[PDB]
Amino acid sequence: GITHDKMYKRSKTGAVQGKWHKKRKYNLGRQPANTKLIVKVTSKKNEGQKISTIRCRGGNIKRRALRLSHGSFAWGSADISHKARILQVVYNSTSNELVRTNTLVKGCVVQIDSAPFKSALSNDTLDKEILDQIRGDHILARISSRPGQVGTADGYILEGPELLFYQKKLAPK
Amino acid sequence: AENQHERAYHKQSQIFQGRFLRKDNARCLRFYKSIGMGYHTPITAINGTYIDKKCPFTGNVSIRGRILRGVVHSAKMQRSIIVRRDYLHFVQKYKRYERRHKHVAAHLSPCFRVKEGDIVTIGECRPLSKTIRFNVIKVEPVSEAAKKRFSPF
Amino acid sequence: KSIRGCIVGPDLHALSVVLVDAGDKTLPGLTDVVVPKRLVPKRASKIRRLFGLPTTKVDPKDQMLVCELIKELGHEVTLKNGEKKLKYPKVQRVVTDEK
Amino acid sequence: SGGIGNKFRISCGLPVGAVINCADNSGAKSLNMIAVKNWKGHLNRFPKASVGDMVLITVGRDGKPELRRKVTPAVVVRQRKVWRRKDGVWIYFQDNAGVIINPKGELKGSSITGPVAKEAADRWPKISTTAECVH
RNA sequence: CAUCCGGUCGAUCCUGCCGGAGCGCGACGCUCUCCCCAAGGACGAAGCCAUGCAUGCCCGCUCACCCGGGACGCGGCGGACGGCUCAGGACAACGGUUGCACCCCCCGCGGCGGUCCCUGCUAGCCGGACACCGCUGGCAACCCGGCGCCAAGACGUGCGCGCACGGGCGCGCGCCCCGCGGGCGAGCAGCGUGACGCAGCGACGGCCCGCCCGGGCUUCCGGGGCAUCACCCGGUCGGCGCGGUCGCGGCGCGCCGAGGGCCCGACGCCUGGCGGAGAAUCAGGGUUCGACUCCGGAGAGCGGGCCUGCGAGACGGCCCGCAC
RNA sequence: GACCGCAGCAGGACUCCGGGGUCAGCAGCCUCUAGCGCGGGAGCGAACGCGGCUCAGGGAAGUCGGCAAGCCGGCUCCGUAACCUCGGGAAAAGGAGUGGCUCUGACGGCGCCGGGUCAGAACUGGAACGGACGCGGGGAUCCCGACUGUUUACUAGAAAC
């Protein structure tokens, strides 16, 4: 397998250790998942959001980021949550190339739709910055769940001077 | 929090950075996990913007094993120090000894900055990185220049 | 393994067909021969179907058996011709007191 | 004889002084042509070889030491210049190549690498059986 | 278990090495009336293998021109055990010491055994669908051609207690140190809240957690020679994110900062280099060898990849490159 | 533009001043200024020359010999041996890029102004970039002379001087 073994890496002093044996199945590595997010299904129907379960050591079952576009967010302040399909991947931060293919990454800042979260405007001015994001149908949030290992699209909502730090980049930079 | 040089914001993962927004009052702003073996933490390490996931006092790291000690020679690596322990080996053929030495790396946090020539304990921990497996806890700076003398402490 | 192409070539050794709708003129020695099917339905689900009782659903009667008098494999050394016991393919798929 | 059968003439592209590639697993990296068998030369005519013409070649310094400094019979499998078979199809092989064959036709090594032309196969059978593809 | 003596000369007294003398292991040679216990292709051939055998065992489901002896297959489990050889491999393998609050596991064993249902429902039992076979196919063999019925302790649909209960989430202790209990040495687990969601098994209801277990990393102290090898590494070395794995990790993949390690000999090179428990011979002090019992590591001509599974990169699994 | 070569002869004759554009350039290739259309013209596009251009496949096998053609080249950036009079070889050898656009950084003076040089990026061109022009083929040795220099104007430029 595409192993992940210490012997393959050089020693700290720069020694190149010859591997004692061949590569091992419990040290096996797998295909990095490139997640697919649909801006619109529109006329085409060939692609749908499908998830992959894979064989693992010990029989454990792993859900994967095969095709995930629908997304869930729980307002930290409210503790209530709403589920819809998120707009796309906006701030991978590791690479801007990943954003183009909408490859989802754990806790990568994304573009969030407000199809069921428009209800926030009914409460009086809760998170006015979120209120300005919710009516627009475009928000910022980090999908804080592991997509490749556990196939999860549930995520937190961005609130706090952390959202402002990201927003300063998200607005013109 | 308002600075815009770092490509990304860094926060304590255990506390939601969203938990506190306005009129902060009854919530705990910093997650601190008390370390094992009862080594005291200076209030300097409890207060600050230091996250340092590698640091045990704040961040998700816990010490699980022996607590060796050595002296700090290098602190250039980012947030990392190389401590040298000395082992005196008894050889039987000649009952005289050899002062073989080892340089081991750990993770320091800005909460306890180190001077040169200090006694720094390293805690057996989760394998942090390729060379990193230890973490600093107690620092005792020695006056002037401590040199070596091959002292194991 | 090498697999022969589906479209035919010039060989004479191997080929095989089926008649989707043989019409009239089924051959006396070939297609016409209508032969009974051996291994007659042996399950209660098949008993409520081809065997003969389709609308029964779960069967109150429970057991339907077309006796099989056939002997079993090798006999002539023993010469017990008189005991061709009339067993059935075992009846099954019923919730007996045991279930 | 060893080359057996009748070949319709196909356009001949490799003259003498040509280093055709060698695709055999015998390990001869490259073969330099010396002559083509059965060539009645006209005045000032370099002898030339088509696909499937037995040629005597000498292995170069790159090739294994044992086969060097000797004339070895070979059969050209691929010729770059397009050749017209009687079907009227015009076919051109990507790179000039040869396989070392016995006077009998037994190859020095079993494997033939890459494509083999159909004219080489009729004249020389062992190549035909071991050909990965007969294009 | 603390030792000699023949030899430089005309002699002597020496240093110094040569030689015997002791003892073990294998050759070899000369040879055997014994008897008993016994190593046995380790030795620059981990060279090639002709010829046989070396992981097989029970039919729940039998309807087979039988009998109470049951073929066969579907299935069930074992062939990841063993046996063998040490080729490769020099902070590795390896002995002991740590931890895994960075982690998987089949057998067995002690608990749990509520499982909403949107849909279809027969829920006191639903499907259609394959082998065996029956009939007729090829080839030089290998190899397995169709059709026709037909069952499962076979495979699949699905009933059932929204304190449903699959994970994984999102989110909720603290208040300068320390004690409390489901807690530890360590604030770790769990619960609650909110969103999903479809794991159970179930057509003869067994999922789950432990214990063991065998792994998988890992911490220290050890772990060949060579300086007619002195400066070396460039993911190299620290962070910062992320992917990936049973899993931590440069392990990978992005992003940065310039680090690492060295005369206590780094890096390099070589090894007719498997390490240890051990073995040899000796007062002590040593020296020498560790392939063979056992213990761990490797590897099945050679490199790669992959399946099946709870675990193998298995090789009397597979598939390719290369030889033969 | 009339001198001297029998002549109104693709020959030899000394300087003065020397615009723009690409470009390193008083280069090449175009151009303002300034001159000016030469021992004449039309057909016809045979052989054969003379001055170029290209060629499938292979390539020195041609030949006395790679003669001649051809290959290479500008720029930037790595990488650069043996030998050695340690100065060289060395442009050794061997690679990578180069276009047009959209832009961002370094330097003299804010109160407005200097100058285009270099880097660094995107985005795009049938998979193209020194796109014309100018513009090394390279390595292995051996033999003579050390070389910079001079030579038999009208057959020998060397190993000769």
Helix (H) or strand (E) holding B140: strand B136-141
How distant is the Cα of A165 from the closest Cα of chain B, in angstroms?
Answer: 6
> Phi, psi at residue D57, to the nearest 5°?
-130, 155
Phi and psi based region of residue D13 (left: phi greater than 0; alpha: psi -120 to 50; beta: remaining): alpha
With H, G, I as helix, E, B as strand and everything else as coil, classify residue B94.
Answer: coil
Q: At how many Å resolution was this determined?
A: 4.9
Question: In angstroms, how far is E153 C1' from C93 CA?
Answer: 14
DSSP string covering B40-89, please?
Answer: ---HHHHSSS---TT-SSSSS----S-EEEEEEEE--STT--EEEEEEEE
CA–centroid distance for A87 within its chain: 12
Nearest to B18 among A9, A12, A76 (CB): A76
What string of H, E and C letters represents the secondary structure of chain A? CCCCCCCCCCCCCCCCCCCCCCCCHHHCCCCCCCCCCCCCCCCCCCCCCCCEEECCHHHCCEEECCCCCEEEEECCCCCCEEEEECCEEEECCCCHHHHHHCCCCCCCEEEECCCCCHHHHHCCCCCHHHHHHHHHCCEEEECCCCHHHHCCCEEECCCCHHHHHHHHHHCCC
Place of tokens 């796309």: A88
Nearest to B1 among A12, A76, A161 (CB): A161
Please give the C-alpha separations between residue D87 and each of D49, D92, D122, D131, in angstroms, as whole numbers: 21, 14, 16, 22
Q: Which of A105, A78, A76 shows the shortest CA–CA distance to A93? A: A105
The answer to the question of whether D25 is labelled as a binding residue is: no
* Residues written for chain D: 135
Give chain F positions with protein CB within 7 A. 56-61
Integer Cα distance of C91 and C86 in angstroms: 13
Question: DSSP class of residue B23?
Answer: S
Please give the C-alpha separations between residue B38 and each of B33, B122, C78, in angstroms, as whole numbers: 12, 14, 90
Residues 131-150 of A with CB under 7 A from strand E: 144-150
**Cα dihedral B13, B19, B21, B22 sign:** negative
> Would an 8 Å CB–CB cutoff place B2 in contact with chain A?
yes
Contact A16, A8 (CB under 8 A): no
Give chain E positions with protein CB within 7 A. 61-67, 69-70, 88-93, 98-102, 104-106, 122, 124-129, 132-134, 137-139, 143-152, 166-179, 184-188, 193-198, 204, 215-222, 232-255, 257-262, 264-268, 273, 285-287, 297-300, 304-314, 322-324
Question: DSSP class of residue B149?
Answer: T
Place of tokens 């490509």: B7
Domain ranges in chain A are: 30-173
Question: In angstroms, how far is F31 C1' from D88 CA?
Answer: 58
Residue to test with chain B: of A162, A163, A166, A167, most B Cβ within 10 A? A162
Contact B73, B85 (CB under 8 A): no
Strand F close to D82 by CB, under 7 A: yes
Strand B118-123 and strand B136-141: the pairing is antiparallel
Place of tokens 């910022």: A140
> Phi, psi at residue C10, to the nearest 5°?
-100, 10
Residues 6+ apart with CB under 8 A from A33: A52, A64, A65, A66, A103, A147, A148
Give the closest nucleotide to D81 (alpha carbon vs C1'): F57
Q: Which of A136, A4, A158 shows the shortest CA–CA distance to A76? A: A158
- Tell me the two tokens of residue A68: 């995930």
DSSP string covering chain C, please?
Answer: -----SS--S--S------SS--S---TTTTT---PPSS---SHHHIIIIIS-GGGSS-SS------B----S--TTT--GGG---B-SPP-----TT-
Q: Say whether the D–C interface has 3 or more Cβ pairs within 8 Å.
A: no
Strand F close to D31 by CB, under 7 A: no
- Tell me the two tokens of residue B56: 């045990």
Structure solved using which method? cryo-EM
Strand D48-49 and strand D97-100: the pairing is unpaired
Residues 53-82 of B with CB under 7 A from strand E: 53-54, 60, 62-66, 68, 74, 76-80, 82
Residue to test with chain B: of A94, A165, A167, most B Cβ within 10 A? A165
Integer Cα distance of A104 and D6 in angstroms: 66
Strand A154-156 and strand A70-74: the pairing is parallel
Integer Cα distance of A115 and A87 in angstroms: 11
Give the closest nucleotide to A155 (alpha carbon vs C1'): E170
Which amino acid is it at B70? G
How distant is the Cα of A164 from the closest Cα of chain B, in angstroms?
Answer: 7
CB pair distance less than 8 Å for B20 and A160: yes
The CA R_g of chain B, rounded to the nearest whole Å, is 19
* Residues paired with residue A88 on neighbouring β-strands, in sequence order: A111
Give the closest nucleotide to C38 (alpha carbon vs C1'): E149
Integer Cα distance of B136 and B121 in angstroms: 6
> Would an 8 Å CB–CB cutoff place A169 in contact with chain B?
yes
What string of H, E and C letters represents the secondary structure of chain D? CCCCCCCCCCCCCEECCCEEEECECCCCCEEEEEEECCCCCCCCCCCEECCCCEEEEEECCCCCCCCECCCEEEEEEECCCCEECCCCCEECCCCCEEEEECCCCCECCCCECCEECHHHHHHCHHHHHHCCEEC
Contact C45, C93 (CB under 8 A): yes
Residue to test with chain A: of B6, B7, B16, B20, most A Cβ within 10 A? B16
**B9: exposed, middle or buried (Cβ count in 10 Å: 0-12, 13-18, 19+):** buried
> Phi, psi at residue D130, to the nearest 5°?
-90, 0
Integer Cα distance of D31 and D62 in angstroms: 10
For residue A65, the tally of other CB atoms under 10 A from its CB is 25
Nearest to A165 among B1, B19, B131 (CB): B1
- Tell me the two tokens of residue D10: 């196909």
- Tell me the two tokens of residue D9: 């003439």
